[PDB]
Paper text:
PrimPol is important for both nuclear and mtDNA replication and belongs to the archaeo-eukaryotic primase-polymerase family that differs from other DNA polymerases by possessing a primase activity. ModN (residues 35−105) interacts primarily with the template DNA strand and the template oxoG base, whereas ModC (residues 108−200 and 261−348) carries the catalytic residues Asp114, Asp116, and Glu280 and interacts with the incoming dCTP nucleotide: functions normally associated with the finger and palm domains of DNA polymerases, respectively.
To produce the insertion ternary PrimPol complexes with the correct C incoming nucleotide triphosphate opposite the oxoG lesion, we crystallized the catalytic core of human PrimPol (residues 1−354) with a 17-nucleotide (nt) DNA template (5′-CA(oxoG)CGCTACCACACCCC-3′) and a 2′-deoxy-3′-terminated 12 nt DNA primer (5′-GGTGTGGTAGCG-3′) in the presence of dCTP. The overall structure of the PrimPol complex depicting insertion of the correct C opposite the template oxoG residue (oxoG•dCTP) is refined to 2.60 Å resolution and is similar to the structure of the unmodified complex (T-dATP) (root mean square deviation (rmsd) of ~0.35 Å over 249 Cαs of molecule A complexes). Only one ‘metal B’ Ca2+ ion, chelated by the oxygen atoms of the triphosphate tail of dCTP, is observed in the oxoG•dCTP complex despite the intact 3′-OH primer terminus. Somewhat different from the unmodified complex, the N-terminal helix (N-helix; residues 1−17) is slightly shifted (by ~2.5−3 Å) and rotated (by ~3°) away from the major groove of the DNA duplex, allowing for the formation of a salt bridge between the side chains of Arg3 of the N-helix and Glu105, the last C-terminal residue of ModN. The template oxoG base assumes the anti conformation about the glycosidic bond and forms Watson−Crick (WC) interactions with the incoming dCTP. The C1′−C1′ distance in the nascent oxoG(anti)-dCTP base pair is 11 Å, which is slightly longer than the C1′−C1′ distance in the T-dATP pair of the unmodified PrimPol complex (10.4 Å) and in a standard WC pair (10.5 Å). Thus, the O8 and the O5′ of the oxoG are now located ~3.5 Å from each other.
Residue numbers in the entry: 2 to 17, 36 to 200, 261 to 348
Write the structure that this text describes.
DNA sequence: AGCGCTACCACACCCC
DNA sequence: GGTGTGGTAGCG
């Protein structure tokens, strides 16, 4: 459908031996995904923010290993984002946030725990998928002004058709809470202008959504995403990779663990 | 040389 | 009111 509008941006763009390493940058997100298809190695698309104060981004294309190599030190490649590809199987993830000054009475730690408890029950009744908070990688990036956290579920042999179906899944189970714009009232939070919003950010389930990487911070601020204090997902200890690299892989929404019995979850609106 | 929508206006009809 | 446009600021 939108494939015709894709190259129309290319048409619109008319008046505008060493060791094996793949490190290709692109100024157009479309050119990035074109190279991935025309490449054999397990490669993925990253988005790096530019000095511009706005959200202008450039797009790196490389493997998870080579990326972490030049990324682990956190001296370079600051303000990076995962490009959750469209139509690509992905994990269940959450962007949770509320303004602290406008929501003092609420306790963040207790809300995230209640949300998981409810999502897990939902995952058992809809799809028969059993998981607990021990399968939820908990990331935090809060400030004094904003309670901010990312959740990435680590379901065993389970994944969603794509992130759009992840949004349909949440809009479905969170419809009772949305009505207050079973006891899901704890998800309601007041924003800056006094409006009533939902603790879950249902606006991160779009095509080619950018999602801030583990140990990355927004180009403006300086707070990077780190493993939350009360996180209870611990990857498998492996002598061939660093534990931080394990969390990095687990944090990647699109890095779905291969399996010969994978159940792909779907949800139509 | 970022990307991809929703939310929110404006106006157009349509019918008791 | 109810519903269908349809174009943009503005958000994530
Ligand atoms: N102008 C923007 C803003 C955000 N995003 C993407 C990247 C983010 O990872 C995601 C969610 O945006 P948030 O505003 O929630 O940013 P974060 O939640 O990652 O940071 P924080 O919540 O700490 O502000 O949407 C984007 O592509 N363009
Ligand atoms: Ca957020």
């Amino acid at each position: 459908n939108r494939k015709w509008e894709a190259k129309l941006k290319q048409i619109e763009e008319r008046a505008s031996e060493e060791p094996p390493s793949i490190w290709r940058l692109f100024h157009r997100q479309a050119q990035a995904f074109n190279f991935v298809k025309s490449c054999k190695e397990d490669v993925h698309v990253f988005a790096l923010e530019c000095k511009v104060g706005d959200g202008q981004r450039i797009y790196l294309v490389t493997t998870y290993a080579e990326f972490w190599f030049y990324y682990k030190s956190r001296k370079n490649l600051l303000h990076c984002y995962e490009v959750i590809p469209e139509n690509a199987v992905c994990k269940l993830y959450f962007d949770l946030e509320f303004n602290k000054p406008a929501n003092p009475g609420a306790d963040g730690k207790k809300m995230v725990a209640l949300l998981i408890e409810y999502v897990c029950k939902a995952l058992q009744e809809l799809y028969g998928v059993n998981c607990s908070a021990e399968d939820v990688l908990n990331l935090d990036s809060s400030t004094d002004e904003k309670f901010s956290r990312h959740l990435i579920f680590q379901l065993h042999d389970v994944a969603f058709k794509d992130n759009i179906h992840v949004g349909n899944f949440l809009r479905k189970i969170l419809q009772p809470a949305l009505d207050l714009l079973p006891d899901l009232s704890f998800l309601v939070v007041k924003n800056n202008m006094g409006e009533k919003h939902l603790f879950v950010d249902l606006g991160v389930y779009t095509r080619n959504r950018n999602f801030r990487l583990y140990k990355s911070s927004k180009i403006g601020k300086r707070v990077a995403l780190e493993v939350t204090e009360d996180n209870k997902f611990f990857p498998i200890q492996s002598k061939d990779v660093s534990d931080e690299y394990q969390y990095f892989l687990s944090s990647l929404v699109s890095n779905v663990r291969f399996s010969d019995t994978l159940r792909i979850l779907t949800c139509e609106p």
